Design a protein around this ligand. Structure first.
Ligand SMILES: [Zn+2]
Ligand SMILES: [Zn+2]
Ligand SMILES: [Zn+2]
Ligand SMILES: [Zn+2]
Ligand SMILES: [Zn+2]
Ligand SMILES: [Zn+2]
Ligand SMILES: [Zn+2]
Ligand SMILES: [Zn+2]
Ligand SMILES: [Zn+2]
Ligand SMILES: [Zn+2]
Ligand SMILES: [Zn+2]
Ligand SMILES: [Zn+2]
Lengths: 116, 115, 116, 115
């Protein structure tokens, strides 16, 4: 995969499973145009988002749905999504994995970028 | 302070000094409206952004400028900004501190909400 | 303070208040020797640990007590403590702030080192 | 694998490759006893450390060598190791993955435990 997203639950120490994810690309007029979407697997991973020729140079946003993921805990989180923005391929053929560790009021994200 | 932002440099182990911060609020037409701005102090802190009256319920984005902060290192980061989005909910005015610990390809943020 | 410790609760979005903290210094025989202790304030901070004179060069461990901090949440955490190790003062005086963002199965810790 | 370790470089945005990992268990006399060791692969992952029979309930420390890892950056880190301590199985038996995202003056670590 040119783009893969992986999500972990830092409260229970488990993959975050069946969670919705939306991907956008910034367009000419400055709006976020819809690019790809899905739900995470049993390992907290979402594979198969895009193709090598669809994944053109530009700026991308990843939105992970969190509103009710912690409902069973009794806590409402800081926002309805966890989100990251990244700039891609100003420089060539590269593959990206976006990794997120999530809690209701805190998260850590990392972009791992490799040249095949 | 209804809203304070504090920024740490996780590569050199120090406050991030003199870095630009812009804050926005989501508007009627779904675009981001300019809300408040300033630059961090000697301690990495930014006070005085807004007032209890201007800071109504809604959805807010904090943008921290990182385009050149890493140059002397010889590394260009994952993106020209670090961005945090939060919802200010109920009833009921709260005070917010947004803390961000920054590296070129990673970041950890935390929102602390009191009252 | 030559040494200050600050603790945040990443699950509830609050300072972590009334939490026990232990500090140790490495000895010759390679055992950790007790060096200072206390409980955090209403701001999640612990001030007054040591003096400039007592805070000599060496290797230090900070232990934050977490066993039952999240009991009211229904979760047992990954360990009875969150711990950090650091190497101190190599040239001239330096002041340290150890900051920790805590959840049951994850944490983020940062050392901020400043020249007075 | 009953125990897997994975290491990421948060400064360059890549897996941490060929880095040394030593694992210990808290012994009778309260000292750390050597338990298992290895080096990370091209993916930043370390598999094959132990067996279901050897990995009994107890307290374990994972030590990641970082002394010379950012020398080429020009910075000396907060300490010569990154360390995680966890209690097992507590449980038992579960499978553990310890993930660490590393910078010179910071780190983030997460234990994922499955049955
Ligand atoms: Zn894939
Ligand atoms: Zn959604
Ligand atoms: Zn959002
Ligand atoms: Zn203030
Ligand atoms: Zn800006
Ligand atoms: Zn941006
Ligand atoms: Zn103090
Ligand atoms: Zn204790
Ligand atoms: Zn311990
Ligand atoms: Zn070694
Ligand atoms: Zn394996
Ligand atoms: Zn060590």
């Amino acid at each position: 995969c040119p783009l893969m997203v992986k999500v972990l639950d830092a409260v229970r120490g488990s993959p975050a499973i069946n969670v919705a994810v939306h991907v956008f690309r910034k367009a000419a007029d400055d709006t976020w145009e819809p690019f790809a979407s899905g739900k995470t697997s049993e390992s907290g991973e979402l594979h198969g988002l895009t193709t090598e020729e669809e994944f053109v140079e530009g700026i991308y946003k990843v939105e992970i749905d969190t509103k009710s993921y912690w409902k069973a805990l009794g806590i409402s989180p800081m926002h309805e999504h966890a989100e990251v923005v990244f700039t891609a391929n100003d420089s060539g053929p590269r593959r990206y994995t976006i990794a997120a560790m999530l809690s209701p009021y805190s998260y850590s994200t990392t972009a791992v970028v490799t040249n095949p």
